[PDB]
Design a protein around this nucleic acid. Structure first.
Ligand code: FES
Ligand SMILES: [K+]
Ligand SMILES: [Mg+2]
Ligand SMILES: [Mg+2]
Ligand SMILES: [Mg+2]
Ligand SMILES: [Mg+2]
Ligand SMILES: [Mg+2]
Ligand SMILES: [Mg+2]
Lengths: 162, 99, 38, 177, 174, 161, 100, 40
RNA sequence: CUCGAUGUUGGAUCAGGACAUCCCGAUGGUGCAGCCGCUAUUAAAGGUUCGUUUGUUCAACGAUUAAAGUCCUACGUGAUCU
């Protein structure tokens, strides 16, 4: 990877770029014919929001996603890994990939509400004051429909609406 | 009239009580009710629900054995399903034929 | 804002953003183009 | 068993004390487990008229996790009876106001809708944090396993676990990241 | 202890003597109520821990009454305190630094001019009252045909609900 | 060191249940013979006390033990005091072992005897129909013939091979 | 080392078939609680010249407080502890049938 | 409740149907004599 | 559904509710300088006049008002009245 450093000395600023150590794909992918990193390692349909060892390899130090052209992911798996990282952040599973805070700002405290499988941004959802009849019931989404094709080891498929 | 029609409820509710008690008894050994009932039939054991509940209350060493047998047969099913028929049937999967 | 079921950019500075769970049209050049998803 | 009759009857119909840890647990799966035990449905001698419910103690009810967006979407409705008395609160507002309410409301709704239900509520013991009264603690017999596996945060993996998982792609040497 | 912000001290029990005018330098007339402090003492201290509330409490007592007309447990309490019984006892939420040893007398100069006070008492009992006196309902016309209906509530709900809402204003003790 | 179908460890890489390895059939069939011999020895040596059995009689199953009474819901065409053998035995159990038929245990293995101790009829049982507004009402009373059997003896023979 | 169920609580189960394959044999001896899994019985809980008196704690409560005490002690609601009228008291069977 | 499995084995879906559990005699005289045939 | 009766338009009395908001709050747009407007989003806690006239609901008119809202409640309410 590549860094950028700005050092100001004697009213003079010097902006440079250094090349740091770079990781490399582990040798012998179980499926070298795979197109994207996922299919090359027989990982399609086999990861979830809690598999951070996988998800942490496709995000920036501050929790942002990395571009598809750089990672090489298929457009499809990019959307799965993108949703999975959104949910992993909201589950408190990426406690080091936190947003950069300018000028040492100390955020005001928030209520701790543990959560998992959170499809929507918490501040963006309204209360369900009128649940509606049983034949038109306003449901609560759980998980993501992007992961519907994940391998299900139970005879019942994932329920995405509670 | 309630007494006449209550004969249908009495039979229906006895079965739900037996099932409820068997579900309790199976869970103590880590089985679900259908895994126990389904696999006992596959072992050719035809003990019905009333007897099984009686065993769960009064003969728990026996009931645990019935649980182990059903659990064993269920594992033979998993092993069989994984195979393509080349492997022989499990020990407790073999059916006694009558003629 | 005007509430709209179909959001249409009216210019070339009119940009589409989703905030608060709904889509918006914000235009800094022509504020009369601002739309809200209904 | 060769017990005498009364000690035999006493042992069979005794009340057991269970512990359940609500940390990171969905309140409904805590509720499903407790509802069985409070009713006695886990006992092969179960009968509705036999009064064979058990004691369930649940700690860490403040640290329950809802799945999805239920912290914001789930609403608890009530009416004071007076005109204008309809009150609706989200699960989050309720949790911050009363840290056992949500688990209490999940359990209460799962118990039979009959007159035995408020009695089964008297053998339920909810505590928001790790503290449990000593008298309650000395009653306990068995701790139930948590119905949800808590997934590890990335910082909690050992370096052996990190090293075991393979690097799936090579980042360009010239990418700023 | 010295006073600190957030600190809450005790109040008193007084007897309402009556009302009187006074005038301010501006020439404005204000009526005032005379509250006499009659034998006010601290009776009990309850620690913040034992009160079951967020504050400690200090129980104060008002007027000396007859030992002959008080219950034995109450007489037993006052014998241990070493005071004659009080007619009324009230609980005051205080901060820990404001606690006073029970048996301590309280006076009118506990308060000072310019301060504001809240005064709590039981209102004058008026007995069972109709809606006009109790709730300010208008009643009905005096003439123009009215049949036996001059001071009545009128309708008490709508037909649809088939009931009367809890909290409905009705004749009762005032 | 990665097979063609290798999948790195994730939450869904493998099934949630643990892997189970069934015993080798050759060893187990040997292990089975030792267990059967062990249980057959307990029968020869009488290392058991009270036995219970499950019998299929008159359409239903009865968990029975010596001295038990069972109420049969029909006439049996046997004189009071007559001793009979119960021939459909599903299960005989002891404190420390149980024998299971598939579905019935062999006659050479277990013997259950019972005695007719009463031939009677049940208490009267009402059968009443009613349909409102239809002048539809009927009453019928029935008593069912019954037989009380006492289980005398449960005997097992060391015929396990 | 395969076991269908754990063998550490109720009995050590061993399943077997006879040579003919027609009889399933179940050997289930009970497991005994090991000594090391037990606790010792809880033994642990003047100048007086006067015969120690019985300190009889004769204390009377009113129905309300009494029922609160019984409800808490036995973990019930209050409703069990209230009386019933003559009609229901006189309907209860005082010589119920007894089975063994 | 086991009906489809019994059918796969050439058995009646209901164990109350044909086969020894139902068709064999229920009892015999304790002396050995066979019982008269059951009505069903 | 009610004809072996579910009597009463308007008014009085007491009002419960909706929000499609008349006024008071917070916003966006404006052919919004400002003062007033117009239009939209949010908001139902609180409020929403007295008269002349007509049996009237409706309307007109005189004075006001921050405003004199639209609706439902058996055209709310007649074992409370008219
Ligand atoms: S997973 Fe193979 S193309 Fe993306
Ligand atoms: K009519
Ligand atoms: Mg008047
Ligand atoms: Mg008159
Ligand atoms: Mg009059
Ligand atoms: Mg009529
Ligand atoms: Mg109103
Ligand atoms: Mg009307």
């Amino acid at each position: 990877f590549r860094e950028v450093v700005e050092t100001q000395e004697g009213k003079t600023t010097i902006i440079e770029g250094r090349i740091t150590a770079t990781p490399k794909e582990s040798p012998n992918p179980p499926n070298p014919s795979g197109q994207c990193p996922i299919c090359r390692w027989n990982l399609k349909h086999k990861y979830n929001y809690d598999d951070v060892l996988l998800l942490s390899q496709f995000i920036r130090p501050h929790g942002g996603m990395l571009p598809r052209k750089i990672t090489g992911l298929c457009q499809e798996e990019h959307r799965k890994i993108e949703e999975c990282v959104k949910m992993a952040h909201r589950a408190g599973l990426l406690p080091n990939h936190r947003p950069r805070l300018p000028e040492g700002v100390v955020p005001k405290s928030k209520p701790q509400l543990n959560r998992y499988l959170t499809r929507w941004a918490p501040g963006s959802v309204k209360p369900i004051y009128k649940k509606g009849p049983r034949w038109n019931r306003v449901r609560m989404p759980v998980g993501s429909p992007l992961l519907r094709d994940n391998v299900c080891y139970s005879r019942t498929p994932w329920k995405l609406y509670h | 009239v309630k007494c006449t029609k209550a004969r249908y409820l009495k039979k229906k509710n006895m079965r739900t009580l037996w099932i409820n008690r068997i579900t309790a008894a199976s869970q103590e050994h880590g089985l679900k009710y259908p895994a126990l009932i389904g696999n006992l039939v596959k072992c050719q054991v035809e003990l019905n629900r009333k007897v099984l509940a009686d065993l769960a209350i009064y003969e728990p060493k026996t009931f645990k054995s019935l649980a182990a047998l059903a659990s064993r047969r269920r594992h033979e099913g998993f092993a069989a399903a994984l195979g393509d028929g080349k492997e022989p049937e499990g020990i407790f999967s073999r059916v006694v034929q009558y003629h | 804002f005007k509430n709209k079921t179909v959001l249409k950019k009216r210019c070339k500075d009119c940009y589409l953003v989703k905030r608060r769970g709904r889509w918006y049209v914000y235009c800094k050049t022509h504020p009369r183009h601002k739309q809200r998803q209904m | 068993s060769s017990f005498s009759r009364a000690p035999q009857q006493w042992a069979t119909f005794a009340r057991i004390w269970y512990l359940l840890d609500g940390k990171m647990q969905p309140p409904g799966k805590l509720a499903a487990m407790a509802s069985i035990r409070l009713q006695g449905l886990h006992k092969p001698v179960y009968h509705a008229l036999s009064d064979c419910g058990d004691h369930v103690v649940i700690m860490n009810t403040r640290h329950i996790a809802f799945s999805g967006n239920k912290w914001e979407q789930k609403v608890y409705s009530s009416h004071t009876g007076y005109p204008g008395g309809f009150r609706q609160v989200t699960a989050a507002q309720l949790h911050l106001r009363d840290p056992v309410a949500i688990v209490k409301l999940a359990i209460y709704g799962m118990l039979p809708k009959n007159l035995h239900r408020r009695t089964m509520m008297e053998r339920l013991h909810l505590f928001p944090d790790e503290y449990i009264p000593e008298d309650i603690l000395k009653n306990l017999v068995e701790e139930l396993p948590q119905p949800r596996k808590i997934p590890k945060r990335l910082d909690e993996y050992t370096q052996e676990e990190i090293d075991a998982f393979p690097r799936l792609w090579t980042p360009p040497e010239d990418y700023r990241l | 202890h010295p006073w600190e912000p957030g600190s809450f001290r005790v109040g008193l029990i007084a007897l309402k003597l009556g009302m009187m005018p006074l005038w301010t330098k501006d020439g404005q007339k204000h009526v005032v109520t005379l509250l006499q402090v009659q034998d006010c003492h601290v009776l009990k201290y309850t620690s913040k821990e034992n009160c079951n509330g967020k504050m400690a409490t200090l129980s104060v007592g008002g007027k000396t009454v007859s030992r002959f007309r008080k219950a034995t447990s109450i007489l037993e309490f006052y014998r241990e305190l070493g005071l004659p019984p009080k007619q009324t006892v009230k609980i005051f939420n205080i901060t820990d630094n404001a606690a006073i040893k029970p048996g301590t007398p309280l006076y009118a100069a506990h308060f000072r001019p310019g301060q504001y006070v809240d005064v709590t008492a039981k209102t004058i009992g008026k007995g069972f009252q109709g809606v006009m006196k109790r709730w300010g309902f208008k009643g009905q016309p005096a003439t123009h045909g009215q049949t036996k209906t001059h001071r009545r509530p009128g309708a008490v709900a709508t037909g649809d609900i088939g009931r009367v809402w809890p909290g409905t204003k009705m004749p009762g003790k005032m | 060191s990665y097979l063609p179908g290798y999948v790195p460890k994730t939450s869904l890489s493998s099934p949630p249940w643990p892997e189970v390895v069934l015993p080798d059939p050759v060893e187990e069939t040997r292990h089975h013979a030792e267990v059967v011999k062990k249980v057959n020895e307990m029968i020869v040596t009488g290392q058991y006390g009270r036995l219970f059995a499950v019998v299929h009689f008159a359409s239903r199953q009865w968990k029975v033990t010596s001295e038990d009474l069972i109420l049969i819901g029909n006439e049996l065409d046997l004189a009071c005091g007559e001793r009979i053998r119960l021939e459909k035995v599903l299960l005989v159990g002891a404190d420390n072992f149980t024998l299971l038929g598939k579905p019935l245990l062999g006659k050479d293995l277990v013997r259950v005897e019972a005695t007719v101790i009463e031939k009677t009829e049940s208490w009267p049982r009402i059968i009443m129909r009613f349909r409102k507004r239809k002048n539809f009402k009927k009453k019928r009373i029935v008593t069912t013939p019954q037989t009380v059997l006492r289980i005398n003896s449960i005997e097992i023979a060391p015929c396990l091979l | 080392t395969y076991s269908p169920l754990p063998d550490d609580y109720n009995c050590n189960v061993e399943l077997a078939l006879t040579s003919d394959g027609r009889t399933i044999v179940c050997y289930h001896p009970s497991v005994d609680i090991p000594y090391e899994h037990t606790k010792p019985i809880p033994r642990p809980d003047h100048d007086q010249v006067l015969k120690t008196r019985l300190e009889e704690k004769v204390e009377h409560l009113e129905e309300g407080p009494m029922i609160e005490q019984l409800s808490k002690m036995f973990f019930t609601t209050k409703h069990r502890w209230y009386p019933h009228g003559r009609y229901h008291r006189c309907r209860k069977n005082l010589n119920p049938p007894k089975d063994r | 409740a086991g009906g489809q499995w019994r059918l796969q084995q050439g058995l009646a879906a209901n164990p109350s149907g044909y086969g020894p559990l139902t068709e064999l005699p229920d009892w015999s005289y304790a002396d050995g004599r066979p019982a008269p045939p059951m009505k069903g």
